[model samples]
Target: GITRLMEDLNDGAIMLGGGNPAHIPAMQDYFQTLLTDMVESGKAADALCNYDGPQGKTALLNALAVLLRETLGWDIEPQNIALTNGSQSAFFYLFNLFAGRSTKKVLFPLAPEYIGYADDLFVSARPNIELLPEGQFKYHVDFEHLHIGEETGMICVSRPTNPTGNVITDEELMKLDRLANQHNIPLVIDNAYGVPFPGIIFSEARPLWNPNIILCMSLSKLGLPGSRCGIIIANDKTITAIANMNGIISLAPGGMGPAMMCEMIKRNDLLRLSETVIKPFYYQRVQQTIAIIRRYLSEERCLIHKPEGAIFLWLWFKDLPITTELLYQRLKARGVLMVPGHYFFPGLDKPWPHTHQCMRMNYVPEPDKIEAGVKILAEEIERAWREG
Candidate 1:
């Protein structure tokens, strides 16, 4: 409630901090149509007045199963799905499911994953970092150092990873999945910005799933974050475990989000909007933001991570004299909000210069506002270079 507050921006606060999805107008209007139909048919009460089972609204789950099978040709069933208040909640359950009790640690095979993932970890994680060569920037799995020790509980990664928009290659995912299988663990892939719905991925990425892979998805990116509905596709056993968890925790995940989405799935409108409107909108923003950064910021000073997917552009300040944390404070004082880089790296043994030099900026906002933020960033980076 406190973050942006709508008027905060009008009062001159620029927010590139949180992972809130863009308020796509076309998607909003589509949901409005769904709402209208629900209300006209008197089915809105089902969401507002009644409670869904912990597994989520059966109709929605059934529709989603059918949609996935038909659209993606995935061999999933309604029994393979479960719901949570949001994917964040689901992550907490999944993380604790494997971690809290033993020497087991959640392994983020590649470092600098999600800022949100950092906090909910029940036990400290082991993150392996492989800083790419300076000229072309992106983090790859440090397989050479990626040791899934006996203490390793489960493997989790965000596809089209947060903060950095880099999507791990299909080959990499296959390898991770294989490693998880060999060790007899679950590989949880966060698909909050991924395919089938809210298809924000701008690169070639195949939607992947199997019993061993727990794919987490959300409606938040589809302009329904307030609904707080998260989807989990896993084996029937795992799905049942999540359902039991939900039954105890919140009685059930809220009905509104699933109810809101059920019809959209039946008519296949969610996929259509995701492909036609959502993907194009963010692709345009990514391009616009990149052009603006290139125009204002010199490549000699900073290198941007390849914008493969997600709503963010990760900028690494090459040889930045001061840390991005200090830069974040400088920008915050000036009414701009961007995430400092260091916080995204959940598990590191020591301070890494490469981590401190990087920062994440959201491209989900307007061009002028983003340019305004970038201009300030450029000036600050130059200031750091000169003064430090």
Candidate 2:
């Protein structure tokens, strides 16, 4: 199973897949420094032997609270930062708490979106998950068509959404906020990718919008996914509720993860590292990948979402003659693996709909490997086009 997934694409076909932070030298440096400090302080034993507590460690919470205030300008206290295994788990706890086992249902945009949480919602046997119809990649959610059953509980949206790589317009978000208020439901905003190259700012337009909005963010896309640390920020009431739920299920996050995160923030180097080192490097890779796309694929044959914030590109191939699954298998035979659009939609019955020729591609690999990978993808796409 693991080998089928391709652990590393070193010798594979051109890869424009994966949402990993490919330009994080400074983050690596920070981790190395933390390791050295641990060795010097003779705290290595604590690093290996310490078990995490419930509700996370107090010191780490305090550090996170301070970091949020100083760095992100949120007026949140330590109590608001409920650390979980990662943002994925954090969403599970929140969904279960808000809509679990209730007749309430959650809303998400249709295909070309990440359906990770939707899967969790099903497994939890909580509120049923509903997919709104497909809209333009840039403006996917149409509030007019949204149906809120009496049992409707929460609406979850990823700002700068996954796969599509388009940030939700402020206008759209405000409209959703209004709808949430009208329905008396909570709006859970997944800000998982809202804090890297192109950061998103949460608006404070209305008082009701303030507390009812739950924001979950992480350092995985910017710092490291292996750390498996994330945060939940909201008003006191919602924070308390989330905390209570977290206590029952997750208990607490690991101590070393939070400690290392605190250390990174204290250095005052997180933003600088992402901007100076990671952003530019990743931008260059994206540009190179785009150039390759232009060379091999026509505008009408394939359309790619020009990434503004996140680390991946959503490519739609309306004119491609093959199904995404077939294309995926063909490429995989050549040692390439790309995430298909169907993976992002939970309720889809057919894999190849008229609008389903899409795939999420990442440009966050080494420069040389990126060029080579794109070349292989280009050849595969050309062959697929001809054969299909």
Candidate 3:
């Protein structure tokens, strides 16, 4: 999906794809300042010029541990944390780590998960998708049918999600955590877009972690994607497992992310700006995108999945003449690029028509461009409906 979007942009297409995050000017300015200060303070020598320990940067690990313990009341230590080249890299490691007996299963409690997770397991992992039903526009976690078998090796989820923006509630998260504890497995929470740093959420969700939760966070959404930083917090045993793997594969996680983040944490810049600037910026943009969707798209057939947080929106077209792939193809031909829903659902037991009818739309671009794309989308859907 990332390479496809890059090619489309190279071809001068208007991007409705979700890969590119909004370039917030405030964040860019702050990062520029951090970089200049780091170099001046001689921190860059240790951060950029040398190889950090396999476990991670001590400065970052200690600062983050203090933040979690003091702010969230979590019982944690520096030894409980680790770093990776990127969260995607960490996911690759985590997926493969849980893949000894491929037939045992890597479980997903919900269907239509992240596209990046589709093929992360290196072997023939029998991935199970607990599909959530589209009852209304907001797809809730299907707890009634959520059955974790004994074969389940691990449970993973992305809060505020990746493509579809259906947010799992606070209660929903606790239930999932309980299920993992009950099953004697670790619950991996991908917090790349959730509470605390770069706080992209607009729903009721708090920072949650226990000894059994493997919380993964990233600096990508915080305008530090170039830093390639991933923060992993878990118990001491799991932390040791990651460090042991990190030495063999990566040698060390990059040092720049930690060096920069440590200063930000000491000054409380990360959470302060997340609450004041970044959260409101995306929330306003989300509202702007919704109005444009209503201005052009008809509600007779299409329904906008409820947006709780994140920079993307999901649209479901009921009784459509063609699949979402055909719609994506049409848009691509017209100098527009968006995600076909088919690529997002991993671990499915069978083909699903619901996946065929829905699509994910990126809203992080300017409002004018988003409205233009929406107008073109409406015209294509209208003609497709009429001709069929």
Candidate 4:
């Protein structure tokens, strides 16, 4: 995929896969001042040269606690949080911890989930897919059919989910939380692209949390993917276990990200920028991408998932001749890139037809590129139908 992406870029291809955020000038200015202050205060050496504790730097953790309490009305202690190299690492630790101990399974309550979650090294990972009713774009969680057995280790879902950009409702989240609590399992909420921070949520849902919820967040969508910082908010026991695991595996998470953004988080500057700058930027991009799709792709030929949050648009082709994986290759040959939908529906017990009919397009590219790419994609869809 990387080789194809590079070749396409060399040939002027439009990339619509990686959910990279556009660079913001204001963020650059903020980082300059942050690093300058650290240098003048002689704290830069301490942060960069010395190793931090497994849980993370005290300064950053304290700042996060303050931000959560002041902005979100969540009274969390510093001990309740743990930092990791990135959200992926945090997930690796969490999944392995639960599945490694016994014959239990880590359950994804919703299918068409994040592709990253499906690649974990867990032995007994399972997915309970709940498709929406006919003519609906969203994926629902049917409580009537949802079942948690004794072998279930944990329940997990991504709000403002990755590929589909579906934001699960607060009511739905509460229902899942209650079910997990009843089963005595943890409910892991991947909020890497959701509310409070990076505030990209475009739906009616709010950030939901409880003692039974494990909230995972990242700085990637905040235009800081290079920082490689991930934050975890959970109960005291889970936090301690995560910290211990961090100590054993990585010794300490990177300190530069926390040191640079600690004051911004404490003063709520990051949150303000997310609300005023980041969210609006992506919202306009989404609108433009949708308009482009409508102009080129007919509804009968393609069905787009109602994008609520996140940077992706999920497109389901109706009765196309080829699988999305084949379509992905054809699109790349014509200088466009997208992720195949089958990757998102991981650990399905049996083959599902809908899985191969969809593809995920990231709408973060420039308008001209988006237009060109969508036009090419639509043309290819029609060509595939004729050929098939």
Off by over 4 Å in 3: 1-11, 53-56, 115-136
Could you give candidate 1's per-residue lDDT for residues 42-124 as a string of tens digits?
67776777665322388888988988998888999999998777877888888767775646778887767883434633222
Question: What order do candidates take by TM-score, descending?
Answer: 1, 3, 4, 2
TM-score of each: 0.92, 0.81, 0.91, 0.90
Estimate the lDDT of model 1: 0.79
RMSD of each: 3.5, 5.6, 3.6, 3.5
- Which residue runs of candidate 4 sit more than 4 Å off their true CA positions? 1-11, 36-45, 53-56, 115-136
- Candidate 2 has its poorest 10 consecutive residues by lDDT at 122-131
**Each prediction's Cα lDDT score?**
0.79, 0.62, 0.76, 0.77
| Residue 340, model 2: Cα distance from true site in angstroms | 1.1
lDDT of 3 by residue, 64-179 (tens): 99998888889989889988887777777787676445355666666556734335331111223232333226666677767677767778878888777767778878998998
Tell me which residue pairs clash in candidate 4: none
Tens-place lDDT digits, model 4, residues 1-388: 4455445545476788776777767767766787788789766766677676222378778888877877778868898888888778888888876664547776776777873433632221233334343222777776665667887788878888888888877787888888899988999999888877787878888777777889998887888877878889999999999988888888345777777667566556788888888888889888888888989876778877778898899898967779988898899888788878877766665577788899988888788988999889988998898885
- Among these predictions, the greatest lDDT belongs to 1
Regions of model 1 farther than 4 Å from truth: 1-11, 53-56, 115-136
Flag the better candidate by TM-score, 2 or 4. Answer: 4
- State how far residue 155 of model 3 sits from its true place (Å): 0.9
